[PDB]
Design a protein around this ligand. Structure first.
Ligand SMILES: Cc1cc2nc3c(=O)[nH]c(=O)nc-3n(C[C@H](O)[C@H](O)[C@H](O)COP(=O)(O)O)c2cc1C
Ligand SMILES: Cc1ncsc1C(=O)Nc1ccc2ccccc2c1
Ligand SMILES: O=C(O)c1cc(=O)[nH]c(=O)[nH]1
Length: 365
């Protein structure tokens, strides 16, 4: 479309040249929350529909956690064309996160580095925000547009498990799925929660709290993992997931690695790297986790998706759903319709009746 090219060539670079990344993001969140968006043209066909996690998803393309940290733009995000929305990460108490600047663009690499450190309005503010539209969400969900809530922990928290348990109790009843985020590179000691003993202990507590919720308010529980795990870590995670009956995995968060070939002046900034240089590392992690869980644990694939091909590669590798964030930073809102339209065309070209037929197809070759 001409809208794609206008945003890609004119609008986004001009926004970029004018505002630093954090300011541009705040403005984007504001515009989104007010529905100030280019025409919602693409109509989802039935072949994009997916049933997973106890829900119908009208299309498999979602917005990744981090864009709407505080639950302010949910409805604007559905209007943008996402088949599902994930907000967060949300920490139990409000906290400011790291000192600025804490987000950096690498235009030459179509990548972003961020070290926000879980800036969050906190559970109580997000709870009230979600309660104010709770019944509208219930209809959205019924209509195939579910809501996920991603949980973090406070910087000064002594007991990580209790932070997550609080999140489950407070936001669990408002969510179609919860995400236990143990893969942020920007909170000290957080990623060590991916280790086998700590993870089993953490998730047992999380699942107990979840199971104590009334039935209609009882979300699926997913774990979001890093792209930088050893083979040992991945095998352990797969084992804990199957031992405890975890409902799904989100694969993956940003990388602390700096792949060879990065050109951006800011490539050596501390933080998690997202976007294009993350893409295949993410796709390969999905492929491994799908195999280790025997295709029985739903995976949401995320990391450097900016096209239908990117989405389909993750789906064929084993993802039932995909998410994007960074692509929006460079292509703007038209990227959502673009990904969906290309995905549908590729599914037809490759002989799939629909998205469901494509999930894990690479493993059956
Ligand atoms: C600026 C920024 C903030 C993010 N904040 C969160 C977060 O709070 N919680 C989380 O689980 N992931 C967070 N992420 C990670 C994304 O959800 C996603 O896993 C990652 O960026 C890879 O996807 P992408 O290449 O499409 O951006 C953040 C990513 C970025 C770029
Ligand atoms: C201000 C405005 N008026 C009509 S469309 C429009 C607009 O393009 N808004 C934007 C512009 C850029 C965006 C980038 C990411 C997410 C949402 C975004 C919304
Ligand atoms: O808040 C952060 O800085 C943040 C959290 C997370 O999960 N992933 C990320 O890249 N950054």
């Amino acid at each position: 479309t001409g809208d794609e090219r206008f945003y890609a060539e004119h609008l986004m670079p001009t926004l970029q040249g004018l505002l630093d990344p954090e300011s541009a993001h705040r403005l984007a969140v504001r515009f989104t929350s007010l529905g100030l968006l280019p025409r919602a043209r693409f109509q989802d066909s039935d072949m994009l529909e997916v049933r997973v996690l106890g829900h119908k998803f009208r299309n498999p393309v979602g917005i990744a956690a981090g864009f709407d940290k505080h639950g302010e733009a949910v409805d604007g995000l559905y209007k943008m064309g996402f088949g599902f929305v994930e907000i967060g990460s949300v920490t139990p108490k409000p906290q400011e996160g790291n000192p600025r600047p804490r987000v950096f663009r690498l235009p030459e690499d179509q990548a972003v580095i961020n070290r926000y450190g879980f800036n969050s309005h906190g559970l109580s503010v997000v709870e009230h925000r979600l309660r104010a539209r709770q019944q509208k969400q219930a209809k959205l969900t019924e209509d195939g547009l579910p809501l996920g809530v991603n949980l973090g922990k406070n910087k000064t928290s002594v007991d990580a498990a209790e932070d997550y348990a609080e999140g489950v109790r407070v936001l669990g009843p408002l969510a179609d799925y919860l995400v236990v985020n143990v893969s942020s590179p920007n909170t000290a000691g957080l990623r060590s929660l991916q280790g086998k003993a700590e993870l089993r202990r953490l998730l047992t507590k999380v699942l107990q709290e979840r199971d104590g919720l009334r039935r209609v308010h009882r979300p699926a529980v997913l774990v979001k993992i890093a792209p930088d795990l050893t083979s040992q870590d991945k095998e352990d995670i797969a084992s804990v997931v199957k031992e405890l009956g975890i409902d799904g995995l989100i694969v993956t968060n940003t990388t602390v690695s700096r792949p060879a070939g990065l050109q951006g002046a800011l490539r050596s900034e501390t933080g998690g790297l997202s976007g294009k240089p993350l893409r295949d590392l993410s796709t390969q992690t999905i492929r491994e986790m799908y195999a280790l869980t025997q295709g029985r644990v739903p995976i949401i694939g995320v990391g450097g998706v900016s096209s239908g091909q990117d989405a389909l590669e993750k789906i064929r590798a084993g993802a039932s759903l995909v998410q994007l964030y960074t692509a929006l930073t460079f292509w703007g809102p038209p990227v959502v319709g673009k990904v969906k339209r290309e995905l549908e065309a590729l599914l037809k070209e490759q002989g799939f009746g629909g998205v469901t037929d494509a999930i894990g197809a690479d493993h059956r070759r």
